[PDB]
Amino acid sequence: DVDSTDYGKLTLRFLGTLTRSLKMQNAQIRRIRPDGTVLRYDDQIDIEA
Amino acid sequence: FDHDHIIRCLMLAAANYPRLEGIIVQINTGYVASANVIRPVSEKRYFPENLEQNQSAARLVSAVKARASEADISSIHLAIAREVSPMFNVHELKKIAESFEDPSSIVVVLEFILFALFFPTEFNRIKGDIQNVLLLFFSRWYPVEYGIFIQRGATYTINAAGEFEFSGRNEKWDQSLYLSEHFPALFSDVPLAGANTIIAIMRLFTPQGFLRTDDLAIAANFPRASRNPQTYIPYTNQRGTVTNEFASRFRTIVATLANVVNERAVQDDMQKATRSCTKQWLRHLETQFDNIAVAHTDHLSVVYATMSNFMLNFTNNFSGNHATFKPDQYVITSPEGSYKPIIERQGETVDGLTIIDTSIVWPILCQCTYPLVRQSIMEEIVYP
Amino acid sequence: PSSIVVVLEFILFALFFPTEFNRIKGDIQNVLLLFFSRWYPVEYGIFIQ
Amino acid sequence: STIPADALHLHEFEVEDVTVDLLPHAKHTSYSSLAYNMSFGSDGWFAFALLGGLDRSANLLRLDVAS
Amino acid sequence: GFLRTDDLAIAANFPRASRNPQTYIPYTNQRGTVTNEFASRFRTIVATLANVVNERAVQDDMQKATRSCTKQWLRHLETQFDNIAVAHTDHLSVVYA
Amino acid sequence: RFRTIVATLANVVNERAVQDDMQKATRSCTKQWLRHLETQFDNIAVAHT
Amino acid sequence: RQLFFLSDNPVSAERLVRIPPKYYVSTQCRALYNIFSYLHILRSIANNRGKRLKMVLHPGLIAYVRG
Amino acid sequence: YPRLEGIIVQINTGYVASANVIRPVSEKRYFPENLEQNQSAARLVSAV
């Protein structure tokens, strides 16, 4: 049971319940074209994180 | 403070929990309301003296009082806080039902000019649904030059070689296609031979701001979702000036709009009195803008500056050009599943957060007192 | 155009009391530089040049 | 006996949630006791505040009629 | 409008009083457009009817207000036509078909 | 002297009001007042001078 | 004598009541709705919070003034 | 039987009324706002 301050309990019952809708298998963060294709990582556009 | 981890969990937290936009706006609304920045009052001044009771402008006073909502403070503070906040659910326009019959229907266009100057970031997010209203404006006032603009296209895309590939299809815009490669075509700012007036009026929606880097957020080593975190503050601080250089922009907008409403008036030979009461009202917006441009460009511009340095306002809001800017559409990809986009129109409101009300600029212009308009007491500005 | 009365307040104050007009002729400029900056915008930019 | 010449009441006002302005001469006659019943926060003061004003334009001509 | 053949009546072998049964539907279906091509016809009729009543009123040099209140009424009929022109061409046109 | 000041000021307000294309009635009633200052100036300048 | 400092004019009461402008239905009818706004403020002043009231009408009252 | 027009129209009327294609309402909108009052249009509003 995670650490939860008096404001954090107000946020967790606000979002608040569903998490299992997303596969997290080898998940990365990438941009997409506005067409819909997943772009590769670009060294000069995306952040290093 | 770990920069790599917090910006990495805030991209899961926007994908798993799309109600996170209601958290960051509520934190930003709590900073606007704690600054005592806009305080409503019960005195309307939408009209000058002896024009509301004038019988000639009775067609005009039914078009301003039908657009100007009451000054509710829970929505004016919400409208400021939506600007520097990140966008997770795609903002869509409150539906405006106008037919642009009369020359007193120029009020709806002046509603959009003030909403493009006061909130240029939130103008970009719904600039396409404003085209769906404005294409009913130009097609009933400039029918010769409307068809010249349509044959180029109602949407356009960006080529990889930097050109503007205009489509050529007369399509009503929807707020989906905001995530795709199509742009609104009125805001290209590309001149067209024959359609010189429509491009000229679209040069009045241009922003009057600058592009400030997050100098206090990078040195604090806060999470940011770009390489150079740069936000768009709507107007520069205007110290020591006799003539205010932001209020003088509205002088040159009305001086063009008083020529658009004049050519529409004399085309249908309406009364001298019903035309004079329009232009007296268009320069009553001249006077009431001079009273508040001292207090927007001195007291809001230090609030929009310091709200762009918060921990949770982690995305770029705007660049400075409506003709090229798109939000960086990150996703959470996965090879053994489907990618979940961050910015994704699904209508999942926070009970009124996605519906953008462009009638918020009529209380801001008229029935709101500011803590710098009153010089004659000194308010002793509340620093939160 | 009904605000020409404030200007006629200054003409009569310059004809009846020209000594006291001199002592506050600078504050009458501050009112009148709002007069000429709205009614004659082309000539105002030449004047403050 | 009801007349064809009255429709002409049957109109009723519905109260809303947003207030009036109070006509800045009401701050001046807030103090002190501009008439007897027009003491601060009374019916005649507030009617002089909300309804407001007296024109010169009407009852000069009526002051011109009865001469 | 357009001149439509009776495709579903000849296949039903219904009685018809001519060689090619061609009824006349008053206006085309107008899906998928921004401006209605049947409503813009009424625009170019009032724009012709504007110039007739404008030249007639100046022949009798009547008031500017009595002429503009005519022309404000003519394009008020534009606004009321544009609201109902979607429902005639989409839903009345299939009833005559 | 005040005759030739209002002869200028009734042309400044006339060049202004036709630019805002306002009524002949709202402009002529202003110019009826500008020459009403003429009649009230001609009466009291005998006692000033 | 009844209203010394209160206004004569029903013009001052039209500031206090909005009328949704589908009700303006005859040539004198703007000037008639003012007295409706004029009197009900003066009649009901002991129950005036300082809210702004709004007018609704019977459609026969719309029908009677058309003529 | 020249009354056969009365048969065929009554069937054709019976299809239109069954389609629920037009529902009348008791709200006039023959004029825009501030034109029926307007004294200059008194010759026009009587002919409409």
Residue H35, min C-alpha distance to chain B (Å): 9
CB < 8 Å to B55, chain G: 30
Fill in the amino acid letter for G42. L
* Sign of CA pseudo-dihedral H14, H20, H24, H30: negative
Q: Report yes or no: B50 at the C interface, CB cutoff 8 Å.
A: no
Q: Which of B45, B224, E23 is nearest to G15 (CA)?
A: B45
What backbone phi and psi angles, to 5 degrees, belong to B60?
Answer: -85, -40
- Whether the CB-CB separation of H37 and G26 falls below 8 Å is answered with yes
Return the ∠ at Cα B100 (arms to B97 and B101), rounded to 5°: 120
Work out the minimum CA distance from D50 to partner chain B, whole angstroms. Answer: 12
Q: How far apart are CA G42 and CA D36, in angstroms?
A: 18
Tokens of B171: 């399509």
- Name B210's bridge partners: B233
For residue E43, the chain B residues in CB contact (below 8 A) are 143
Q: How many CB atoms lie within 10 A of CB G50?
A: 12
Interface touch C11/F9, C-beta < 8 Å: yes
Element (H or E) spanning E23, and its range?
strand E22-25
Q: Which among B285, B312, B305 is positioned nearest to B224, based on CA atoms?
A: B312
Say how far apart CA B275 and CA B103 lie, in whole Å: 9
Q: Is G21 on the interface with H (CB under 8 A)?
A: yes
The Cα-based distances of E76 to B272, B278, E69, E81 in angstroms read: 21, 20, 10, 9
Residue E25 near residue E93, CB atoms below 8 Å = yes
Q: Residue B233: beta bridge partners? A: B210
Distances in Å between the alpha carbon of H43 and those of B55, B184, E53? Answer: 19, 46, 14
Question: Could you tell me the two tokens for E28?
Answer: 């085309």
In sequence order, the 6+-apart residues with CB closer than 8 A to the CB of B247 are B289, B290, B293
What's at B315, amino acid-wise?
Answer: T
G19: left (phi over 0), alpha (psi -120 to 50) or beta: beta
Give the F-side interface with B, CB within 8 Å.
20-24, 26
Both tokens of residue G17? Answer: 């009541």
Residues present in chain D in total: 67
Spell out which residues of chain D touch residue G6, defining contact as CB-CB under 8 Å: 44, 47-48, 51, 54
Give the SS3 label for residue H37. Answer: coil
**Position of tokens 């009374």?**
D42
Chain-centroid distance, C-alpha B235: 13
- Phi, psi at residue B93, to the nearest 5°? -80, 140
What's the rounded Cα separation, in Å, for the pair B284 and B112? 17
The amino acid occupying position B247 is: A
Beta strands at G54-57 and D11-14: parallel, antiparallel or unpaired: antiparallel
Q: Are E95 and H16 in contact (CB under 8 A)?
A: yes
Q: How crowded is the C-beta side of H5, counted as CA atoms within 13 Å?
A: 1
Residue of C1, C2, C15 with shortest CB distance to F2: C15
Q: Is the dihedral of CA E39, E40, E45, E51 positive or negative?
A: positive
| Contact call for D and G: 3+ CB–CB distances under 8 Å | yes
Helical pair F2-17 and F24-34, crossing angle rounded to 10 deg: 170
CB-based burial, E59-82: b 16+ in 10 Å, e otherwise: eeeeeebbbbbbbbbbbbebeebb
- G12 class by beta-carbon count within 10 Å (0-12 exposed, 13-18 middle, 19+ buried): buried
Torsions phi, psi for C27 (to 5 deg): -75, -20
| Nearest-angstrom CA–CA distance, B79 and B360 | 8
Q: Does D35 touch chain B (CB under 8 A)?
A: no
Q: Any CB–CB contact under 8 A between A2 and chain B? A: no
DSSP H helices in F1-49: 2-17, 24-34, 36-48
Spatial separation of the C-alpha atoms in residues B182 and B371, rounded to whole Å: 42
Technique behind the model: cryo-EM
Q: Rounded to 10 degrees, what is the CA torsion of B150, B155, B158, B159?
A: -60
Nearest Cα residue to B229 out of B7, B2, B56, B1? B7
Read off the DSSP letter of residue A4.
-
Please give the structure tokens belonging to residue B70: 């009451």
Residues of E in contact with H38 (CB under 8 A): 65, 69
B252/B255 Cα distance (integer angstroms): 5
One-letter-per-residue 3-state SS of chain B: CCHHHHHHHCCCHHHHCHHHHHHHHHHHHHHHCCCCCCEECCCCCCCCCCCCCCCCCHHHHHHHCCCCCCCCHHHHHHHHHHHHCCCCCCCEECCCCCCCCCHHHHHHHHHHHHHHHHCHHHHHCCHHHHHHHHHHHHHHHCHHHHHHHHCCCCEEEECCCCCEEECCCCCCCCCCCCCCCCEECHHHCCCCCCCHHHHHHCCCCCCCCEEEECHHHHCCCCCCCCCCCEEEECCCCCCCCCCCCCHHHHHHHHHHHHHHHHHHHHCCCCCHHHHHHHHHHHCHHHHHHHHHHHHHHHHCCCHHHHHCCCCCCCCCCCCCCCCCCCCCCEEEECCCCCCEECCCCCCCCCCCCCEECHHHHHHHHCCEECCCCCCCCCCCCCCC
Q: Which residues of B touch H33 (CB under 8 A)?
A: 58-59, 62
- For H23, the token pair is 């529902």
Specify the 3-state DSSP secondary structure of F41: helix
- For chains B and E, what is the number of CB pairs under 8 angstroms? 32
Which H/E stretch holds residue G55?
A: strand G54-57
Chains that touch C (3 or more CB pairs under 8 A): B, F
Token pair of B342, please?
Answer: 């961050």
**Helix, strand or coil, per DSSP, at residue F49:** coil
The answer to whether B44 faces chain D, any CB pair under 8 Å, is: yes
**Which residues in chain G are contacts of B63 at CB distance < 8 A?**
none
Which residue in chain B has the smallest CA separation from E50? B268
Cβ of E68 and B171 within 8 Å?
A: no
H10-48 CB burial, b ≥16 within 10 A, e <16: eeeeeeeeeeeeeeeeeeeeebbbbbbbbebbeebbeee
Find, in chain F, the residue whose alpha carbon is nearest to that of B281. F20
* Burial grade of G60 (CB within 10 A; 0-12, 13-18, 19 or more): exposed
Does the distance separating the beta carbons of F5 and C11 come in below 8 Å? yes
Check H31 against E92: CB less than 8 A apart: no
Task: Give the CA-trace dihedral at B312, B315, B320, B321, to 10 degrees.
Answer: -140
Name which of B44, B362, B53, D24 is nearest G37 in CA terms: B53
Question: Using the 8-state DSSP alphabet, how is residue D31 labeled?
Answer: S
Task: Name the residue type at position B39.
Answer: R
